[PDB]
Structure formats: C-alpha cells, structure tokens
A = this chain, B = another copy of it.
C-alpha cells in the first residue's frame, strides 16, 4: 500500500529523467522551482491558442474550399491523396451510422405495432429496460 506507491513513484521519476527533450526538461525544472504544474499550464496554453485560432480555422476552411472548387486540388492528385480520401470516406460512413444510432436512441430499429415481434416487447423480463 506504501511500498507499491513508492515503487510507482520511483519508476515514474526514472522515466521522467530518462527523456532527453531539452524543452520538456526545462519546463519541468522551471515548474518544480516555482512549485506549479507543467501539464495544467500546457493545457491552458493550448486552449488559449485554439481560442485565438478559431477565425484562422474559418479562413483556412474557406481557402481550402476555394482550392478544391477551383479544380487545382485534382490537378495534382496522387495516390497519397487517394489514401487520405479513402480514410475520409470511411470516417464519414462510420459517423453517419453513429449519428443514426444516436438519433433514434437505439441500436436496432424500433418495432412497429403491426409487426409480429411486438410480443417480444410485451414479454420483457425487466420492463424498466
């Protein structure tokens, strides 16, 4: 209960010391000196940057739309772009299926009252679920 905690802390300390990233080590040392948390500071910095980059995202979206519509994207089409587009299509399909499932709030389609499967609904072991 205490030996295990000490062992875990020692392992994490060894791994933290092992990494040879100058920036990470510098930030860790600075936060340890100041007594602050590096991970939380990184999270806040990332959120601030994303907040300040929203309109950059919008501008990039419009620029990409113009690039695609102009036909310049397909002029330099390559196999790598085909692979990326296949990945994109797969994600679209899976998202559509998930959206349908959430929209009907049920994995399976609901049973119509005129279907012969209504008996199954009547014979539920636990009507609450």
Using CB atoms and an 8 Å cutoff, list the residues of chain A in contact with chain B: 5, 8-9, 12-13, 15-16, 19, 21, 24, 28, 37-39, 42-43, 45-46, 49-50, 52-53, 55-60, 62, 105-106, 110-111, 118, 121-122, 124, 126-129
Contact between chains at A50 and B56 (CB < 8 Å): no
Contact between chains at B24 and A59 (CB < 8 Å): no
Contact of A52 among B21, B55, B57, B122 (CB under 8 A): B21
Known: A49-B24, A110-B129. A39 touches B62 (CB 8 A): no
Q: Helix, strand, loop or mixed for chain A's interface? A: helix
Contact between chains at B24 and A62 (CB < 8 Å): no
Contact between chains at A46 and B52 (CB < 8 Å): no
Known: A24-B52, A49-B24, A52-B19. A62 touches B105 (CB 8 A): no
- With a 10 A CB-CB cut-off, give which of A45, A60, A110, A129 has the most chain B CB atoms: A60
